[PDB]
Coordinates of C-alpha atoms (C1' of nucleotides) and ligand atoms in Angstrom, one line a residue:
Chain A
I1 CA 0.0 0.0 0.0
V2 CA 1.6 3.3 -1.2
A3 CA 0.0 6.7 -0.6
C4 CA 0.3 9.7 -2.8
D5 CA 2.7 11.3 -0.2
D6 CA 5.1 8.3 -0.4
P7 CA 8.1 8.7 -2.6
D8 CA 7.2 5.4 -4.4
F9 CA 3.7 6.5 -5.4
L10 CA 4.4 7.5 -9.0
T11 CA 6.2 4.3 -9.7
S12 CA 3.6 2.1 -8.1
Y13 CA 0.6 3.9 -9.7
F14 CA 2.2 3.7 -13.2
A15 CA 3.1 0.0 -12.7
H16 CA -0.6 -0.8 -12.1
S17 CA -2.2 1.7 -14.5
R18 CA -3.3 0.1 -17.7
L19 CA -3.9 3.5 -19.2
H20 CA -0.4 4.6 -18.4
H21 CA 0.8 1.4 -20.1
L22 CA -1.2 2.0 -23.2
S23 CA 0.2 5.5 -23.6
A24 CA 3.8 4.5 -22.8
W25 CA 3.6 1.5 -25.2
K26 CA 2.4 3.8 -27.9
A27 CA 5.1 6.4 -27.3
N28 CA 7.7 3.7 -27.4
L29 CA 6.3 2.3 -30.7
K30 CA 6.5 5.7 -32.3
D31 CA 10.1 6.1 -31.2
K32 CA 10.9 2.7 -32.5
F33 CA 9.4 3.5 -35.9
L34 CA 11.6 6.6 -36.1
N35 CA 14.8 4.7 -35.2
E36 CA 13.9 1.7 -37.4
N37 CA 13.4 3.8 -40.4
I38 CA 16.0 6.6 -40.0
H39 CA 17.6 5.6 -43.3
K40 CA 14.6 3.9 -44.8
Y41 CA 12.2 5.9 -46.9
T42 CA 8.7 4.8 -45.9
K43 CA 6.2 7.5 -47.0
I44 CA 3.2 7.6 -49.5
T45 CA 3.2 10.1 -52.3
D46 CA 0.5 11.6 -54.5
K47 CA 1.5 9.1 -57.2
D48 CA 0.8 6.0 -55.1
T49 CA -2.4 4.0 -55.2
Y50 CA -2.7 2.1 -52.0
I51 CA -4.7 -0.3 -49.9
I52 CA -5.1 0.0 -46.1
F53 CA -5.1 -3.1 -43.8
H54 CA -6.2 -2.0 -40.3
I55 CA -5.3 -4.9 -37.9
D56 CA -6.4 -5.2 -34.3
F57 CA -6.2 -8.0 -31.7
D58 CA -9.6 -9.3 -30.6
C59 CA -10.2 -8.4 -26.9
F60 CA -6.5 -8.0 -26.4
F61 CA -6.0 -7.9 -22.7
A62 CA -8.6 -10.6 -22.0
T63 CA -7.1 -12.9 -24.6
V64 CA -3.5 -12.5 -23.4
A65 CA -4.4 -12.6 -19.7
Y66 CA -6.3 -15.8 -20.4
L67 CA -3.5 -17.4 -22.4
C68 CA -1.0 -16.6 -19.6
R69 CA -3.4 -17.2 -16.7
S70 CA -2.2 -18.6 -13.4
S71 CA -2.9 -22.2 -12.3
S72 CA -5.8 -21.1 -10.1
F73 CA -7.6 -20.3 -13.4
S74 CA -6.4 -23.5 -15.2
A75 CA -9.9 -24.8 -15.8
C76 CA -11.2 -21.5 -17.2
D77 CA -12.7 -21.8 -20.7
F78 CA -12.3 -18.7 -22.9
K79 CA -15.0 -19.9 -25.3
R80 CA -17.6 -20.7 -22.6
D81 CA -17.0 -18.5 -19.5
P82 CA -17.5 -14.7 -19.2
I83 CA -14.0 -13.3 -18.6
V84 CA -12.9 -9.7 -17.6
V85 CA -9.5 -8.2 -16.8
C86 CA -9.6 -5.9 -13.8
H87 CA -7.8 -5.0 -10.5
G88 CA -10.7 -5.3 -8.1
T89 CA -14.2 -6.5 -7.1
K90 CA -16.5 -3.5 -7.0
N91 CA -15.8 -0.1 -8.6
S92 CA -12.9 -1.4 -10.6
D93 CA -12.8 -0.8 -14.4
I94 CA -13.3 -3.7 -16.7
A95 CA -10.4 -3.0 -19.0
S96 CA -11.2 -5.8 -21.4
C97 CA -13.8 -8.5 -21.6
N98 CA -14.2 -11.5 -23.9
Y99 CA -17.1 -12.1 -26.3
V100 CA -18.9 -14.5 -23.8
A101 CA -19.0 -11.6 -21.4
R102 CA -20.2 -9.3 -24.1
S103 CA -23.1 -11.7 -25.0
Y104 CA -24.6 -10.9 -21.5
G105 CA -24.3 -7.2 -22.2
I106 CA -21.0 -6.6 -20.3
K107 CA -19.0 -3.8 -21.9
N108 CA -15.5 -2.4 -21.4
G109 CA -15.3 0.5 -19.0
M110 CA -18.1 -1.0 -16.9
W111 CA -17.3 -1.4 -13.2
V112 CA -17.1 -5.0 -12.0
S113 CA -20.2 -4.4 -9.8
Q114 CA -22.2 -3.2 -12.8
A115 CA -21.2 -6.2 -14.9
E116 CA -21.9 -8.9 -12.3
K117 CA -25.6 -7.9 -12.2
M118 CA -26.0 -8.7 -15.9
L119 CA -25.1 -12.3 -15.3
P120 CA -28.0 -14.8 -14.9
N121 CA -28.0 -16.8 -11.7
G122 CA -25.5 -19.8 -11.7
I123 CA -23.0 -18.1 -14.0
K124 CA -19.9 -16.7 -12.4
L125 CA -17.8 -13.8 -13.7
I126 CA -14.1 -14.8 -14.1
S127 CA -11.9 -11.9 -13.1
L128 CA -8.3 -12.2 -14.5
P129 CA -5.4 -10.0 -13.4
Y130 CA -3.4 -7.8 -15.8
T131 CA -0.3 -9.4 -17.3
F132 CA 1.5 -6.3 -18.5
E133 CA 4.8 -7.8 -19.5
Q134 CA 3.0 -10.5 -21.5
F135 CA 0.9 -7.9 -23.3
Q136 CA 4.2 -6.3 -24.3
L137 CA 5.7 -9.7 -25.5
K138 CA 2.6 -10.5 -27.6
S139 CA 2.8 -7.0 -29.2
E140 CA 6.5 -7.7 -30.0
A141 CA 5.5 -10.9 -31.8
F142 CA 2.7 -9.0 -33.6
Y143 CA 5.0 -6.2 -35.0
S144 CA 7.7 -8.7 -35.8
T145 CA 5.3 -10.8 -37.8
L146 CA 3.9 -7.9 -39.8
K147 CA 7.4 -6.9 -40.8
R148 CA 8.6 -10.4 -41.6
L149 CA 5.7 -10.9 -44.1
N150 CA 7.2 -8.2 -46.4
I151 CA 3.8 -7.3 -47.8
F152 CA 3.6 -3.7 -46.6
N153 CA 5.3 -0.5 -47.6
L154 CA 4.3 1.3 -44.4
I155 CA 3.5 -0.2 -41.0
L156 CA 2.1 2.5 -38.6
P157 CA 1.7 1.8 -34.9
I158 CA -1.7 2.8 -33.6
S159 CA -1.4 1.0 -30.3
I160 CA 0.2 -1.9 -28.5
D161 CA -2.1 -4.2 -30.4
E162 CA -3.3 -2.2 -33.4
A163 CA -1.5 -1.2 -36.7
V164 CA -2.3 0.5 -39.9
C165 CA -0.5 -1.3 -42.8
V166 CA -0.3 0.2 -46.2
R167 CA 0.3 -1.7 -49.5
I168 CA 1.1 0.3 -52.6
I169 CA -0.4 -1.2 -55.7
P170 CA 1.5 -0.6 -59.0
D171 CA -0.8 0.3 -61.8
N172 CA 0.5 -2.6 -63.9
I173 CA -0.7 -5.1 -61.2
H174 CA -4.4 -6.0 -61.1
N175 CA -5.5 -6.0 -57.5
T176 CA -8.4 -8.3 -56.7
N177 CA -10.6 -9.2 -53.7
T178 CA -9.1 -12.7 -54.0
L179 CA -5.6 -11.4 -53.5
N180 CA -6.8 -9.2 -50.6
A181 CA -8.7 -12.0 -49.0
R182 CA -5.7 -14.3 -49.1
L183 CA -3.5 -11.6 -47.7
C184 CA -6.0 -11.2 -44.8
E185 CA -5.9 -14.9 -44.2
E186 CA -2.1 -15.1 -44.3
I187 CA -1.8 -12.2 -41.8
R188 CA -4.5 -13.7 -39.5
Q189 CA -2.9 -17.2 -39.5
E190 CA 0.7 -16.0 -39.1
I191 CA -0.2 -13.8 -36.1
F192 CA -2.3 -16.6 -34.6
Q193 CA 0.8 -18.8 -34.9
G194 CA 3.3 -16.1 -33.9
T195 CA 1.5 -15.2 -30.7
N196 CA 0.7 -18.8 -29.6
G197 CA -3.1 -18.3 -30.0
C198 CA -4.1 -14.7 -30.2
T199 CA -6.5 -13.7 -33.0
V200 CA -6.7 -10.5 -35.0
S201 CA -9.4 -8.9 -37.1
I202 CA -8.7 -6.9 -40.2
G203 CA -10.4 -4.1 -42.1
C204 CA -9.3 -3.7 -45.7
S205 CA -10.1 -0.7 -47.9
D206 CA -8.8 2.2 -50.0
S207 CA -9.2 4.8 -47.2
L208 CA -8.2 5.0 -43.6
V209 CA -11.7 5.7 -42.4
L210 CA -13.3 2.8 -44.3
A211 CA -10.6 0.4 -43.2
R212 CA -11.5 1.4 -39.6
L213 CA -15.2 0.8 -40.3
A214 CA -14.5 -2.5 -42.1
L215 CA -12.5 -3.6 -39.0
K216 CA -15.4 -3.0 -36.7
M217 CA -17.6 -5.1 -39.1
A218 CA -14.9 -7.8 -39.2
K219 CA -14.8 -8.4 -35.4
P220 CA -14.5 -10.9 -33.9
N221 CA -11.8 -13.1 -35.4
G222 CA -12.6 -12.2 -39.0
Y223 CA -11.8 -9.8 -41.9
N224 CA -13.8 -7.5 -44.0
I225 CA -13.0 -6.0 -47.4
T226 CA -15.0 -2.9 -48.2
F227 CA -13.7 -0.5 -50.9
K228 CA -15.2 2.9 -51.9
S229 CA -16.7 1.2 -54.9
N230 CA -18.5 -1.4 -52.6
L231 CA -20.3 1.3 -50.6
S232 CA -24.0 0.7 -50.0
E233 CA -26.9 1.8 -47.8
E234 CA -26.6 -1.5 -46.1
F235 CA -23.0 -0.8 -45.1
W236 CA -23.9 2.7 -43.6
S237 CA -26.9 1.2 -41.9
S238 CA -24.6 -1.2 -39.9
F239 CA -22.9 1.6 -37.9
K240 CA -23.8 3.8 -34.9
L241 CA -22.8 7.5 -35.1
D242 CA -19.9 7.1 -32.7
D243 CA -18.5 4.2 -34.8
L244 CA -16.9 7.0 -36.8
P245 CA -13.4 7.7 -35.7
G246 CA -13.3 11.0 -33.9
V247 CA -16.9 10.9 -32.8
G248 CA -17.3 10.1 -29.1
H249 CA -20.0 10.6 -26.5
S250 CA -19.9 14.3 -26.6
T251 CA -20.0 14.6 -30.4
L252 CA -22.7 11.9 -30.5
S253 CA -24.9 14.0 -28.3
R254 CA -24.5 17.1 -30.4
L255 CA -25.4 15.1 -33.6
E256 CA -28.5 13.7 -32.0
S257 CA -29.8 17.1 -30.9
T258 CA -29.0 18.7 -34.2
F259 CA -30.3 15.9 -36.5
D260 CA -33.2 14.5 -34.5
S261 CA -31.5 11.3 -33.2
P262 CA -30.2 9.5 -36.3
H263 CA -29.9 5.8 -35.4
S264 CA -27.3 4.8 -38.1
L265 CA -24.7 6.5 -40.2
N266 CA -27.2 5.9 -43.1
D267 CA -29.7 8.0 -41.2
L268 CA -27.2 10.8 -40.6
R269 CA -25.9 10.8 -44.2
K270 CA -29.5 11.2 -45.6
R271 CA -30.4 14.0 -43.1
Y272 CA -27.3 16.2 -42.7
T273 CA -26.2 19.3 -44.5
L274 CA -22.5 20.3 -44.4
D275 CA -23.2 23.7 -42.9
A276 CA -25.6 22.4 -40.3
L277 CA -23.1 19.7 -39.4
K278 CA -20.2 22.2 -39.1
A279 CA -22.5 24.4 -36.8
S280 CA -23.3 21.3 -34.7
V281 CA -19.8 19.8 -34.1
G282 CA -17.3 22.3 -35.4
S283 CA -15.9 23.2 -38.8
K284 CA -13.0 20.8 -39.0
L285 CA -14.8 17.9 -37.3
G286 CA -17.9 18.6 -39.4
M287 CA -15.8 18.4 -42.5
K288 CA -14.1 15.2 -41.3
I289 CA -17.6 13.6 -40.8
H290 CA -18.8 14.9 -44.1
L291 CA -15.9 13.3 -45.9
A292 CA -16.1 10.1 -43.8
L293 CA -19.7 9.6 -44.9
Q294 CA -18.4 9.4 -48.5
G295 CA -15.8 6.9 -47.3
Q296 CA -13.0 9.5 -47.7
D297 CA -10.2 10.7 -45.4
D298 CA -9.6 14.3 -44.5
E299 CA -6.4 16.3 -44.9
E300 CA -5.5 15.9 -41.3
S301 CA -5.8 12.1 -41.4
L302 CA -3.7 11.7 -44.5
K303 CA -0.7 13.5 -43.0
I304 CA 0.5 10.3 -41.4
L305 CA 0.7 8.6 -44.8
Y306 CA 2.5 11.5 -46.5
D307 CA 5.1 12.2 -43.7
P308 CA 4.8 9.6 -41.0
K309 CA 8.2 10.6 -39.6
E310 CA 7.0 14.1 -38.8
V311 CA 3.6 13.0 -37.5
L312 CA 5.1 10.4 -35.1
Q313 CA 7.6 12.8 -33.7
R314 CA 6.7 13.6 -30.1
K315 CA 5.9 17.3 -29.6
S316 CA 5.0 17.4 -25.9
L317 CA 5.6 15.5 -22.7
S318 CA 3.3 15.1 -19.6
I319 CA 2.1 13.0 -16.7
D320 CA -1.5 12.8 -15.4
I321 CA -2.3 11.5 -12.0
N322 CA -6.1 11.7 -11.3
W323 CA -6.4 8.6 -9.0
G324 CA -5.2 8.4 -5.4
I325 CA -4.7 12.1 -5.0
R326 CA -5.5 12.9 -1.3
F327 CA -3.3 15.6 0.2
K328 CA -3.6 17.3 3.6
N329 CA -1.3 20.3 3.1
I330 CA 0.6 22.3 0.6
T331 CA 4.0 20.9 1.6
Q332 CA 3.0 17.5 0.5
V333 CA 1.5 18.8 -2.7
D334 CA 4.8 20.6 -3.5
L335 CA 6.9 17.5 -2.8
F336 CA 4.6 15.5 -5.2
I337 CA 5.0 18.2 -7.8
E338 CA 8.8 18.0 -7.4
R339 CA 8.7 14.2 -7.8
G340 CA 6.6 14.7 -11.0
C341 CA 9.1 17.2 -12.4
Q342 CA 12.0 14.8 -11.6
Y343 CA 10.2 12.0 -13.5
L344 CA 9.4 14.2 -16.5
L345 CA 12.9 15.6 -16.6
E346 CA 14.3 12.1 -16.7
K347 CA 12.2 11.4 -19.8
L348 CA 13.1 14.8 -21.3
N349 CA 16.7 14.1 -20.9
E350 CA 16.3 10.6 -22.4
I351 CA 15.1 12.2 -25.7
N352 CA 17.8 15.0 -25.6
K353 CA 15.4 18.0 -25.5
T354 CA 14.6 21.1 -23.4
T355 CA 11.3 22.7 -22.9
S356 CA 10.2 26.4 -23.3
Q357 CA 6.6 26.2 -22.1
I358 CA 5.1 24.3 -19.2
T359 CA 1.6 23.8 -17.9
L360 CA 0.1 22.6 -14.6
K361 CA -3.4 21.3 -14.6
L362 CA -5.5 20.2 -11.6
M363 CA -8.8 18.6 -10.8
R364 CA -10.7 20.1 -8.0
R365 CA -13.7 18.5 -6.3
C366 CA -17.0 20.1 -7.5
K367 CA -18.8 22.2 -4.9
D368 CA -21.9 19.9 -5.0
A369 CA -19.8 16.7 -5.4
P370 CA -19.3 14.3 -2.5
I371 CA -16.1 14.5 -0.5
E372 CA -15.5 10.8 -0.8
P373 CA -16.4 9.7 -4.4
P374 CA -18.1 6.4 -5.0
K375 CA -14.9 4.9 -6.5
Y376 CA -12.2 4.2 -3.9
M377 CA -9.4 6.9 -4.5
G378 CA -11.3 8.2 -7.5
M379 CA -11.2 11.8 -8.5
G380 CA -15.0 11.9 -8.6
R381 CA -16.8 14.8 -10.3
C382 CA -14.4 17.7 -10.6
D383 CA -13.7 21.1 -12.1
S384 CA -10.7 21.5 -14.4
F385 CA -8.1 24.3 -13.9
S386 CA -4.9 24.9 -15.8
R387 CA -2.3 27.6 -16.1
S388 CA 0.7 27.7 -18.4
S389 CA 4.0 29.6 -18.4
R390 CA 6.5 30.5 -21.1
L391 CA 10.0 30.1 -19.8
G392 CA 12.6 32.7 -20.8
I393 CA 15.2 30.4 -22.3
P394 CA 14.4 26.7 -23.1
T395 CA 15.7 24.6 -20.2
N396 CA 15.9 21.2 -18.6
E397 CA 16.8 22.6 -15.2
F398 CA 14.9 21.2 -12.3
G399 CA 15.2 24.3 -10.2
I400 CA 13.6 26.5 -12.9
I401 CA 10.8 24.1 -13.9
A402 CA 9.8 22.8 -10.4
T403 CA 9.8 26.3 -9.0
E404 CA 7.5 27.5 -11.8
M405 CA 5.3 24.5 -11.5
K406 CA 4.7 25.1 -7.8
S407 CA 4.1 28.7 -8.5
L408 CA 1.5 27.8 -11.1
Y409 CA -0.3 25.6 -8.5
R410 CA -0.3 28.6 -6.1
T411 CA -2.0 30.8 -8.7
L412 CA -4.9 28.3 -9.2
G413 CA -6.0 28.6 -5.6
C414 CA -7.0 25.0 -5.0
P415 CA -6.9 24.1 -1.2
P416 CA -4.9 20.8 -0.9
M417 CA -7.8 18.9 0.6
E418 CA -10.0 19.7 -2.5
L419 CA -7.3 18.6 -4.9
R420 CA -8.3 15.4 -6.8
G421 CA -5.9 15.2 -9.7
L422 CA -2.7 16.8 -11.1
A423 CA -1.1 17.0 -14.6
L424 CA 2.3 18.4 -15.3
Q425 CA 3.0 19.2 -18.9
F426 CA 6.0 20.3 -21.1
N427 CA 4.1 21.8 -23.9
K428 CA 6.9 22.9 -26.3
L429 CA 10.1 20.9 -26.8
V430 CA 13.4 22.2 -28.3
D431 CA 16.1 20.0 -29.8
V432 CA 19.6 20.0 -28.1
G433 CA 22.2 20.5 -30.8
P434 CA 26.0 20.5 -30.8
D435 CA 26.0 24.3 -30.7
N436 CA 25.0 25.5 -27.2
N437 CA 26.8 28.9 -27.4
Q438 CA 24.4 31.6 -26.7
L439 CA 24.9 35.0 -25.0
Chain B
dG1 C1' -2.9 38.8 -41.8
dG2 C1' -0.2 37.4 -37.6
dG3 C1' -0.1 35.9 -32.5
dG4 C1' -1.7 34.3 -27.8
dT5 C1' -4.6 31.7 -23.7
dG6 C1' -7.6 28.0 -21.2
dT7 C1' -10.7 24.5 -22.0
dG8 C1' -12.5 20.1 -23.8
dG9 C1' -12.8 16.0 -26.7
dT10 C1' -10.9 11.7 -28.6
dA11 C1' -8.1 7.2 -29.1
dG12 C1' -6.1 2.7 -27.5
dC13 C1' -8.0 -1.9 -23.4
Chain C
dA1 C1' -10.4 -1.7 -2.1
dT2 C1' -7.9 -0.1 -6.6
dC3 C1' -4.4 1.9 -9.9
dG4 C1' -9.8 7.5 -14.0
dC5 C1' -3.1 8.0 -19.0
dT6 C1' -1.5 11.1 -22.3
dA7 C1' -0.5 13.2 -27.1
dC8 C1' -2.8 15.8 -30.2
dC9 C1' -6.4 18.3 -32.4
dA10 C1' -9.7 21.9 -32.2
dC11 C1' -12.4 25.6 -30.3
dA12 C1' -13.8 30.2 -28.0
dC13 C1' -12.1 34.2 -27.1
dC14 C1' -8.2 37.7 -26.2
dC15 C1' -4.2 40.9 -28.5
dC16 C1' -1.6 43.5 -32.2
Ligands
CL1 CL1 -11.1 -5.7 -25.1
MG2 MG1 -15.8 6.9 -32.5

DNA sequence: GGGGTGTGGTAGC
DNA sequence: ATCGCTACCACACCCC
């Protein structure tokens, strides 16, 4: 048991946090792409005609946690029992659940308490622990297999278990559904073999957005090939509005109010107008949705194809701790800020950069929100506050950065006992070069 | 035309 | 118990 005023807190929290792991894994995969390809040219140009294979493990954490489960769970059956991955027994997030669990209505992001009530009498929920190092090892096998197949011109990491793979089609070659289907089956079988039993689904298309939609249709343990020429009202009828990439809960609600609760993407595409959509959700996101309903990518999405090395370059660095934050006084808050700055400066030094702009963000208990939230050590319902500072000279000096961070906290006027979360950010990074002569 | 800030949404499981 | 991260885009609203 490690409290937020213990020196070991950041280490322990990050060791247990699957969301920390997801972000750290992704950052590491981006860095590896850059190192792997530093003398390989890997971009897409205006002259290229290409096909997208969007590949994702099926219920990744639950699959791997099951395959590596301890002997206590030896008689667990992945095809017959409902399985979740989580830390706890009550208000603990279900990070991943298998398709048996989903068949009873259990969904990721539910709390264990919630999901247990959906099970009929006699049927027990199997809760597996996280197996973080095994998640990483299976990801290594995944990316190694994709490269070894030598069928892709560009392999872009999306996440620990998800990649966008691009195949350039020369105009002298006649691409067919049969070639694409056999490629999907080769990929699926090789990954199944290479990971000792994990399955992937694949969406295959001539746009990023359609390959993402095709992938959703392919799950679980399957593939789907839907090109722009194959588009149909039946396709668009298959999807909810937040199945579109970049449409979450908040955008979904805006679309339902504006366009009288469209049920499917086919509903939305027959009702919307471009200006009404831009007014509803914003100009750029409205244009993105407009283009996606034609199966087309927007300019922003295509950037990763045209210059992946620039897109995958890290441009900021931060930590967020919004669980376990219970401080009694400002001395302990300040020590925690100092530990956070030390951690961030270690990362900043690892990548040989300085920073010229920093931000402190905090979560403060809402006035009407309960003092102890329903979730043990949760932030509960909170108000967001942030303040940023431009440093004079770009720096990696602890004295400068930690002092300014503590001063930023001071200016936001959050009493320590109302603090429920903190984020420390280096917003602008500057390269360290061989010439550090400056008057 | 250029610049700036704080706030909020989204994605991976 | 329980581990609600984090990079990036985009917006509203301020200034020359
Ligand atoms: Cl999952
Ligand atoms: Mg979505």
